[PDB]
Design a protein around this ligand. Structure first.
Ligand SMILES: CCCCCCCCCCCCCCCCCC(=O)OC[C@H](COP(=O)([O-])OCC(O)COP(=O)([O-])OC[C@@H](COC(=O)CCCCCCCCCCCCCCCCC)OC(=O)CCCCCCCCCCCCCCCCC)OC(=O)CCCCCCCCCCCCCCCCC
Ligand SMILES: CCCCCCCC/C=C/CCCCCCCC(=O)OC[C@H](COP(=O)(O)OCCN)OC(=O)CCCCCCC/C=C/CCCCCCCC
Ligand SMILES: CCCCCCCC/C=C\CCCCCCCC(=O)OC[C@H](COP(=O)(O)OCCN)OC(=O)CCCCCCC/C=C\CCCCCCCC
Ligand SMILES: CCCCCCCC/C=C\CCCCCCCC(=O)O[C@H](COC(=O)CCCCCCC/C=C/CCCCCCCC)COP(=O)(O)OCCN
Ligand SMILES: CCCCCCCCCCCC(=O)SCCNC(=O)CCNC(=O)[C@H](O)C(C)(C)COP(=O)(O)O
Lengths: 175, 67, 128, 62, 178, 111, 104, 88, 459, 124, 220
């Protein structure tokens, strides 16, 4: 349905084969699904129409809260408590959003694995690659901070990684 | 169905239990015979097992011990 | 004539296979009579209170009280530091701690050394 | 009184379950996932109407 | 389980106990009835072949040898009666046994049902309450100054006495309480 | 809406109704064992349908219906798998349980 | 407690204890829900040899059968598309070494 | 249902039935109050065999200490009735 | 958060102004109302804590503990009124006053923003507990128990105070927010090592750590029922809460320092679980089980990972509820038979069926049957330890076995078998005891229904 | 199997190694060999979702059998011809594998005997 | 997994053949069957193991049900040494137990055949441990051995139970349950095998002697 955006959670065009009966015998599945329709799907549908009619007469809205961008931990003086507080809250919000992005990619991966059946090892290479890239980025950003993590420790980790990369590049250039 | 003890004699039996027992043994044996008649290859095998000794050298592509 | 049975700690010797019960003496008979007299006196003492119509509650057993007290509160007053006690205490209370410390320290040193060289296959290791 | 059991113990639970799955569970992505239906040569797709060709002229090992 | 044990077993008692154990284990080995009868008659003949030995030392030596043979040749899995101490239904119905004093704790609503049963129960309780002191007096008089040597108890001897210490033997719950 | 999921969930759902009724005036009567046996038989005959659907078209499903809790990156949800193994094992177990409870009706009569 | 006489009228039948008699130091370990020391038909130290011999023999023979495996007189199973290179993990931009099978 | 409510008359009948099938005791001279050692003239092994026959008949075992004291059929039936809670 | 603190200080004069036959009713009703009010603290944020004022704040780690305390007070009130029937009115009011003061101290302890105020309240909790144990205990060893309860604590906590004031002379603040935001690494020096030990050993002795646990069997066995409930349910969790708070300043010295405590905790959980297998006293078994669970929590806090912290929080709440329920269950039988020997009263399932059902549920929750929060916390801690080192799965695994054994052992010894013949005074269970068991057990499963409320701030 | 006895008790060199086979070039003894062909396309096998092990050279008969079973669903006794064709293809594949095993065996035997004979000739 | 399954099935089958409690024999039988399933999993045939689980459920439940019927009839007696001639005294129980035993031993075209026969012939035709193969064969011989033990000691011969005969199996619940499980144990194997898609590659080329190995060891 239109409950979710179809670009964030994509699905293939869903090709399904037409029935090709080859027996004079009846199909028990078709009879049973007809009875299920007439006996279950219609009363449930009618109840849903009544519920939706009641819901339409009382329509109200809720909104997505918007957060501005404040200076990061890098633009903060050493002991400036208020700038540190704002940067820390922003960093925690971004950490939560990154966790949710990883969750979305993992949901894509699981749906692909279940959808492709016996051909999942070949038909889901792109999803596995996306998860690998996202997981590598997330692990570089946040892993090994431990409990009592903060934006300052993340910045120290990034600085250490950048220093190591600069040393490696400088040494490789001299080769 | 009321069945009383016997005290050193054979217990009483009702005709229904003998009928059911004989009928079920009979249908078991009928099913076995019918399935064997129609699906014998499920027990005796279907395709002949070849004997590799009767395979010609030319067929296997082996040189006559000279090259 | 037949292969013999050797008793052990967890498979004890049967009464009928006990040579002490086949070479008996009048002293042994007197001892058995005394044991039966003691048991009968205890049984009568118990049954007198068990069948009492006016008794409501539990019948206190001095043997159970002695058992619990000996297993709990009589141990430290009867403890003496001896070579056996000292050795067993030191072993059972020290050896496992250092054994596990050495095992865990070696394992974590190996893991850290492997991580430093960058060959541990830590891909997808998000949660810790 | 005769067939009341099939109503209070089968029909009502299936009504509740079907409503919950159709209008609440499905309203989120990737909640009910089905593996793709099998496709064989010579089949016709319902949505597109495309047909699948036959299979490379069997050597007929009769 | 009902009889008071003695201070020791006599030679004939041990002989009879070994005879019974050997017969039971031989039946365990000889499943079928005719084979068991044959070998049990053979065992009985072997057993009473030394029946007339006037030398007690040789008698005890023979008993010891017989017990060694029994322990070597016993059945590792002998037949046990289902309700015997080793049976498959030994203590099966113990959880259904409830002591009688629990009936004192019933709510008066629960006692409103079964009025005649509780009237009879009151009669029994009155009988026990009346008989207790006479039982205690009889036990005091019969017993020796040192104490009681065995666990055997005396019977009632007077006009309307009840046997002392009878309440918990007579009011056993049941063998199949539920 | 593809009754496979609805029927597979209903089969497991209706097994709990006698457990909920175990505090009513049916757990105190002598009709409780028959009530439970009838419930199991109904569950079996209902579960026979998804097996037929799978035998027809090989249909398999996963249903993640309730989101229990989510860690930072791991999401834990109440999810059921209805592949071949589940739809083949459920009717067999229900059939065996139905037979065994009907047997226990007679075997445990004096309990 | 298992070796106590079960046909005696104990004050505590399940525990097989009498009121007033001395209690063993390790009663809770011998409660007969637990460690049992009753005489066995076969001697201890004889059961041990038989059990250990069985276990060691089975282990040794399993190792022997692993180093002398059983198999049919056939060649390896052959798969069409370069051993299904794209099926077993894809990698569609490497042009692997071609695997070719011939009729015989 | 289960086994019938066994009564004292049934116990006596079965005990006597087992006793007259003992080839060493003649049926006619046997009575309910006959002492095994005095009237029938049996020794201890015969008493043991009688006790095992009773155990097989009634499907449960009597301990040896109790079994030694039973010396006439009336005691046997009384022991059986007390063991199985038989009052009628 | 004075909206919860003031009603308890009002519980005080209400108790002291009540009629002689209405104290229990008023105390129970208003304690339950206070618990309902405190339920509002569960609405926590995702980034920072609820900073009420300069003095008090609520975090996601402390709110479940506060709710547990306020819920436990009515349970102790219900449990105590049975064995205090013959007591005079003034002494009953004094007992209720001690319980109220303990709850007030715990409430103020779990929300103090400064570490020194936390220390003062966490030490003020000692006096009412000691008075309760040494005055309303039953046997003569209670006096000795009180001493073991007192000095064992103080010997651990006196150094901490020194360390605390020292820190304030170096950083200038003990406020937990400022401490967290201005954190600096600890160097590897002898001074820093001893600062670490001073900061840690008080909480270690409170858990208690294996080898420092000898006070706990004595104190928990000799105390009255309400004392045992509060000792096992909340007072042990003070050490865990304090350790989770104080570990923010001990990095990175913690990795080197923790090793002996980790080995002590693991081998000690094994040893205490083994001790539970041979125990003739029913209360001592529950005490040693508490020691084992708290050792698991110590490992969780010490390895210092987010999953370990969630596991520690969940396990602390679950253990509090379970241990209180088990102590109440044991006290019912003790009140019946006036003895603590476990083999004295057997086959109680025959006489008390619903009580046996309560016993079964409590024993099931003790051994961490899924999906109870006991199992959630235990599994999270085990996963964190496995990440720390793959060999830990051995020791933890062994614990998971032994625990179950003794738990079921307890049940099998008390409820199954045949009843003792000469014990003829097992009266039917009262409504009060059944209600106490139900009010213990229902919140556990309700919490299982929604587990994120007890998973702590790392969620 | 007799091959196991011939290898374990028999000389190891003469007998073929199941793990290491073949050891000779495919066109060694043959003047020319046809390349074995595949009927089912990779796309067809992917759509049929056969299996990673059922995608052998007999996959086309398996696809036909699966289609026939799906079409004749209530009559689960109607797909006997297609089953027989798939089984026959599998039997031919197994026979060809036996052919390859025997080829390796007799090639190893002939090669080792010829090398030993040439060495004996050159040694005198 | 293969070695563990092989040792388990052999050990349990060897323990079963000397037992005298019928419930113990059936328990060792199901333990040996579980070992056989473990062996099947060890040779990379999970679907065959699942199929064997499904087949085994029917006749194992029915065998335990018949054992319980015998136990109830003979006053809660479980030792086979006190069970005599129940072939004529208990007709329906006799035929049910005979069918269950024949299905457990893999008689052709019964429910147990369609899984056990395939498992045996898949073990014979795989690159596997030799000792595991030998132990699987010895265990599948011992299975027939202990089935013979049960039938011989429980149903053939002369009575060995106490003289108060209370045998009565004329109860509709017992008959209906056993008959339902009987129909299952007769037809379920064929019905399930023919109605399932091919998830394995069959063995179509097999030596004649190796094709009949299970039958030969069973009759031996
Ligand atoms: C799964 C079933 C689903 C059912 C749905 C509805 C269930 C509502 C249950 C409400 C809570 C249960 C009651 C607990 C307190 C006891 C009440 C009482 O005194 O009973 C006397 C009452 C009156 O009888 P009586 O004649 O007085 O008998 C007294 C005698 O003493 C005779 O007493 P007794 O011998 O009858 O003893 C009581 C009985 C039962 O009593 C109990 O033991 C209750 C406690 C159960 C185990 C607790 C430890 C494990 C913790 C798990 C936590 C789960 C929390 C879930 C949320 C629950 C929220 C409340 O004991 C047992 O039968 C053994 C229980 C073994 C339980 C094993 C379950 C493992 C997990 C199951 C799966 C759960 C998740 C499902 C989803 C999974 C993914 C699909 O009998 C009853 O009312 C029936 C008892 C309830 C049995 C239900 C067991 C399953 C339900 C578990 C809890 C509810 C979960 C709901 C969601 C679905 C799960
Ligand atoms: C991995 C860590 C743990 C591994 C196991 C190590 C050994 C654990 C030892 C546990 C000791 C616990 C003692 C307290 C329990 C209470 C005592 C008790 O159980 O009583 C014994 C009671 C009575 O015996 P019965 O024969 O039934 O007699 C009844 C008729 N009268 O029986 C028992 O419960 C004994 C159970 C002990 C099992 C210990 C042996 C297990 C060894 C496992 C090794 C094999 C590993 C498996 C390999 C498989 C391949 C992956
Ligand atoms: C009873 C009969 C009632 C009849 C009228 C009701 C008819 C349908 C009502 C639909 C109500 C709307 C609805 O269900 O929306 C889904 C709504 C919100 O979605 P969430 O996934 O929970 O949001 C994420 C936060 N958890 O979820 C619900 O409230 C219903 C879910 C019920 C689940 C069934 C029971 C599951 C829990 C069992 C206990 C086990 C706990 C441990 C689970 C372990 C799982 C690994
Ligand atoms: C029931 C058991 C409870 C008992 C446990 C109590 C032991 C607690 C551990 C010892 C705490 C002592 C430390 C006190 C606070 C230290 C704070 C601090 O940082 O001071 C250091 C200094 O550290 C010290 O002075 C500590 C010295 C220790 C003196 C007291 C010794 C107490 C016993 C030590 C061994 C005990 C080991 C732990 C207990 C083991 C369990 C028995 C820095 O000061 P500066 O002089 O400025 O250094 C920088 C410039 N030079
Ligand atoms: C199946 C495997 C186990 C079986 C093996 C068992 C082997 C044991 C067989 C050999 C046993 C013997 O002969 S041991 C022979 C023992 N010899 C004696 O006892 C001599 C004195 N006899 C008496 O005291 C009485 O006559 C008495 C006999 C007691 C009868 O008492 P009553 O007349 O007043 O009833």
């Amino acid at each position: 349905p239109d409950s979710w955006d179809k670009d964030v959670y994509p699905e293939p065009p869903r090709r399904t084969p037409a029935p090709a009966p080859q027996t004079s015998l009846p199909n028990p599945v078709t009879y049973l699904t007809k009875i299920f329709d007439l006996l279950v799907d219609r009363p449930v549908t009618l109840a849903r129409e009544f519920i939706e009619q009641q819901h339409a007469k009382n329509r109200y809205y809720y909104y997505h809260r918007e957060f501005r961008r404040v200076p990061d931990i890098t633009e903060c003086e050493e002991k400036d408590i208020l700038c540190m507080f704002e940067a820390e809250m922003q960093w925690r919000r971004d950490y939560k959003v990154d966790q949710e992005i990883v969750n979305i990619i993992q949901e894509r991966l699981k749906a692909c694995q279940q959808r492709e059946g016996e051909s999942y090892r070949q038909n889901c290479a792109k999803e596995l690659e996306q998860f690998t890239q996202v997981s590598k980025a997330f692990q570089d950003r946040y892993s090994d901070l431990g409990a009592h993590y903060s934006a300052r420790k993340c910045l120290a980790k990034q600085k250490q990684r950048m220093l190591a990369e600069r040393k490696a590049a400088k040494e490789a250039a001299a080769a | 169905v009321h069945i009383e003890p016997r005290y050193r004699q054979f217990p009483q039996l009702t005709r229904s239990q003998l009928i059911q027992a004989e009928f079920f043994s009979a249908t078991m044996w009928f099913w076995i015979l019918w399935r064997f008649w129609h699906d014998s290859d499920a027990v005796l095998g279907h395709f002949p097992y070849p004997d590799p000794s009767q395979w010609t050298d030319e067929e296997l592509g082996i040189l006559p011990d000279d090259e | 004539s037949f292969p013999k049975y050797k008793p052990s700690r967890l498979a004890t010797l049967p009464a009928t296979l006990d040579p002490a019960e086949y070479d008996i003496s009048p002293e042994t008979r007197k001892a058995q009579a005394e044991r039966l007299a003691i048991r009968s006196r205890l049984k009568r003492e118990y049954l007198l209170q068990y069948n009492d119509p006016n008794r409501l509650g539990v019948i206190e057993d001095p043997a159970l009280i002695r058992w619990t007290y000996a297993r709990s509160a009589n141990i430290y007053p009867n403890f003496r530091p001896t070579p056996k006690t000292s050795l067993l205490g030191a072993l059972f209370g020290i050896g496992p701690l250092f054994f596990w410390y050495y095992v865990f320290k070696t394992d974590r040193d190996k893991k850290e050394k492997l991580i430093q060289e960058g060959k541990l296959d830590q891909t997808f290791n998000i949660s810790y | 009184r005769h067939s009341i059991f099939a109503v209070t113990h089968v029909l009502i639970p299936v009504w509740i379950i079907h409503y919950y799955l159709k209008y609440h569970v499905t309203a989120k992505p990737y909640t009910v996932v089905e593996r793709k239906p099998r496709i064989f040569p010579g089949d016709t797709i319902l949505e597109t109407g495309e047909v699948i060709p036959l299979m490379k002229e069997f050597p007929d090992q009769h | 389980a009902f009889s008071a044990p003695a201070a020791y077993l006599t030679h004939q008692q041990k002989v009879l106990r070994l005879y019974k154990r050997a017969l039971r284990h031989l039946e365990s080995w000889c499943v079928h009835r005719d084979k068991y009868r044959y070998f049990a008659c053979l065992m009985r003949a072997r057993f009473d072949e030394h029946k007339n030995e006037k030398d007690m030392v040789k008698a005890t030596q023979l008993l010891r040898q017989a017990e060694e043979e029994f322990w070597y040749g016993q059945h590792p899995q002998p037949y046990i009666f289902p309700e015997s101490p080793g049976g498959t239904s030994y203590e099966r119905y113990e959880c259904y046994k409830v002591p009688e004093w629990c009936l004192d704790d019933w709510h008066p609503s629960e006692k409103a049902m079964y009025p005649d049963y509780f009237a009879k129960r009151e009669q029994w309780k009155r009988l026990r309450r009346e008989s207790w002191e006479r039982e205690v007096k009889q036990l005091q008089e019969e017993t020796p100054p040192g104490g009681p040597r065995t666990e055997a108890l005396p019977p009632a001897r007077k006009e309307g006495d009840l046997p002392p210490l009878w309440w918990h033997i007579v009011t056993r719950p049941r063998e199949r309480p539920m | 809406m593809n009754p496979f999921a609805s029927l597979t969930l209903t089969t497991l759902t209706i097994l709990t109704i006698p457990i909920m009724m175990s505090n009513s005036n049916i757990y105190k009567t002598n009709l409780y064992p028959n009530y439970v046996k009838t419930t199991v038989s109904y569950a079996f005959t209902l579960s026979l349908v998804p097996l037929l659907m799978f035998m027809h078209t090989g249909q398999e499903m996963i249903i993640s219906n309730w989101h229990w809790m989510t860690l930072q990156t791991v999401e834990l949800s109440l999810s059921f798998k209805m592949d071949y193994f589940s739809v083949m094992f459920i009717p067999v177990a229900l059939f065996v349980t139905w037979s065994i409870m009907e047997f226990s009706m007679w075997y445990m009569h004096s309990d | 407690q298992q070796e106590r006489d079960p046909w005696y009228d104990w004050d505590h039948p399940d525990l097989r204890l009498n009121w007033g008699e001395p209690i063993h130091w390790d009663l809770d370990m011998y409660i007969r829900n637990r460690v049992d020391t009753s005489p066995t038909p076969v001697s201890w130290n004889t059961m041990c040899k038989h059990l250990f011999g069985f276990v060691a023999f089975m282990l040794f023979m399993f190792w022997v059968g692993e180093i002398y495996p059983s198999y049919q007189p056939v060649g390896p199973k052959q798969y069409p598309y370069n051993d299904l290179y794209l099926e077993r993990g894809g990698d569609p931009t490497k042009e692997p070494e071609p695997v070719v099978h011939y009729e015989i | 249902s289960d086994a019938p409510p066994l009564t004292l008359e049934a116990i006596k009948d079965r005990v006597l039935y087992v006793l007259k099938l003992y080839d060493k005791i003649d049926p006619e001279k046997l009575s309910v109050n006959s002492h095994f050692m005095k009237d029938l003239g049996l020794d201890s092994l015969d008493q043991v065999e009688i006790i095992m026959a009773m155990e097989d008949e009634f499907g449960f075992e009597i301990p040896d200490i109790d079994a030694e004291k039973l010396m006439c059929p009336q005691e046997i039936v009384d022991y059986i009735a007390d063991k199985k809670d038989v009052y009628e | 958060m004075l909206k919860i603190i003031i009603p308890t200080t009002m519980l005080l004069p209400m108790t002291w102004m009540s009629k002689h036959n209405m104290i229990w009713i008023n105390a129970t009703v208003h304690s339950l109302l206070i618990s309902l009010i405190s339920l509002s603290l569960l609405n926590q944020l995702g980034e920072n804590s609820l900073n009420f004022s300069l003095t008090f704040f609520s975090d996601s780690l402390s709110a479940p503990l506060l709710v547990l305390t306020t819920w436990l007070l009515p349970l102790m009130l219900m449990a105590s009124q049975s064995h205090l029937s013959k007591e005079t009115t003034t002494r009953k009011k004094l007992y209720i006053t001690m319980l109220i003061l303990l709850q007030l101290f715990l409430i103020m302890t779990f929300t103090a923003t400064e570490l020194i105020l936390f220390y003062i309240l966490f030490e003020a909790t000692l006096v009412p507990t000691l008075i309760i144990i040494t005055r309303w205990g039953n046997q003569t060893e209670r006096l000795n128990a009180g001493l073991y309860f007192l000095f064992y604590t103080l010997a651990g906590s006196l150094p901490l105070l020194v360390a605390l004031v020292y820190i304030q002379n170096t950083t200038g603040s003990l406020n937990f927010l400022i401490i967290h935001y201005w954190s600096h690494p600890l160097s590897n020096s002898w001074s820093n090592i001893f600062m670490w030990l001073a900061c840690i050993m008080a909480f270690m002795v409170k858990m208690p750590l294996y080898g420092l646990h000898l006070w706990l069997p004595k104190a928990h066995v000799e105390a009255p029922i309400a004392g045992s409930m509060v000792l096992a349910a909340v007072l042990l969790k003070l050490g865990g809460y304090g350790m989770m708070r104080i570990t923010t300043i001990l990095n990175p010295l913690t990795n080197y320092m923790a090793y002996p405590f980790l080995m002590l905790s693991m081998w000690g959980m094994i040893m205490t679980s083994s001790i539970c297998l041979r125990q003739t006293d029913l209360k001592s078994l529950i005490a040693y089980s508490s020691v084992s669970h708290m050792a698991l929590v110590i490992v969780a806090i010490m390895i210092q990972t987010p999953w370990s912290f969630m596991g520690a929080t969940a396990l602390m709440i679950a253990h509090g509820l379970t241990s209180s329920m088990l102590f109440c269950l044991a006290n019912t039988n003790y009140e019946r038979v006036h003895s603590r020997t476990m083999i004295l009263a057997r086959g109680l399932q025959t006489l008390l069926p619903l009580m046996a059902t309560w016993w079964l549920v409590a024993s099931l929750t003790n051994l961490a049957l899924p999906p109870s929060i006991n199992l959630i916390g235990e599994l999270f801690i085990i996963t964190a330890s496995f990440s720390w080192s793959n060999i830990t799965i051995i020791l933890m695994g062994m614990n998971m076995m032994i625990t179950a054994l003794y738990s079921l052992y307890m049940l099998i010894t008390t409820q199954r078998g045949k009843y003792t013949h000469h014990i003829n005074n097992i009266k039917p269970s009262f409504t009060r005891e059944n209600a106490l068991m139900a009010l213990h057990i229902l919140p556990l499963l309700l919490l299982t229904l929604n587990p994120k409320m007890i998973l702590g701030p790392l969620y | 199997g007799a091959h196991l006895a011939r290898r374990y008790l028999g000389d190891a060199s003469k007998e073929p190694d199941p793990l290491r086979m073949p050891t000779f070039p495919p066109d060694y003894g043959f003047p020319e060999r046809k390349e074995r062909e595949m009927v089912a396309t990779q796309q067809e096998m992917n759509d049929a979702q056969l299996m990673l092990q059922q995608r052998d050279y007999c996959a086309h008969y398996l696809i036909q059998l699966l289609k026939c079973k799906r079409d004749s669903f209530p009559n689960f006794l109607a797909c006997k011809h297609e089953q027989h064709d798939w089984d026959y293809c599998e039997h031919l594949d197994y026979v060809k594998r036996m052919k390859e095993f025997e080829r390796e065996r007799r090639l190893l035997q002939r090669k080792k005997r010829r090398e030993q004979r040439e060495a004996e000739m050159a040694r005198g | 997994t293969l070695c563990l399954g092989a040792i388990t099935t052999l050990f349990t089958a060897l323990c079963a053949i000397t037992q005298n409690d019928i419930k113990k024999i059936v328990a060792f039988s199901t333990s040996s069957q579980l070992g056989l399933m473990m062996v099947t999993i060890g040779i990379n045939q999970p679907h065959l193991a699942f199929l064997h689980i499904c087949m085994h459920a029917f006749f194992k439940a029915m065998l335990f049900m018949c054992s319980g019927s015998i136990i109830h009839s003979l006053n809660d007696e479980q030792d086979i040494r006190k069970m005599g001639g129940l072939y004529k005294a208990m007709p329906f129980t006799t035929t049910a137990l005979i069918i269950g035993s024949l299905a457990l031993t893999g008689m052709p075209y019964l429910t147990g055949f369609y899984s056990k026969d395939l498992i045996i012939e898949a073990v014979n035709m795989s690159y596997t441990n030799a000792w595991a193969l030998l132990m699987t064969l010895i265990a599948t011989s011992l299975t027939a051995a202990y089935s013979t033990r049960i039938i011989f000691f429980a149903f053939l011969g002369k009575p060995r139970f106490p003289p108060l005969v209370l045998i009565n199996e004329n109860n509709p619940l017992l008959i209906n349950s056993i008959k339902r499980l009987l129909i299952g144990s007769i037809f379920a194997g064929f019905i399930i095998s023919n109605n399932i898609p091919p998830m394995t590659v069959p063995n179509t080329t097999m030596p004649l002697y190796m094709k009949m190995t299970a039958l030969i060891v069973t009759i031996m």
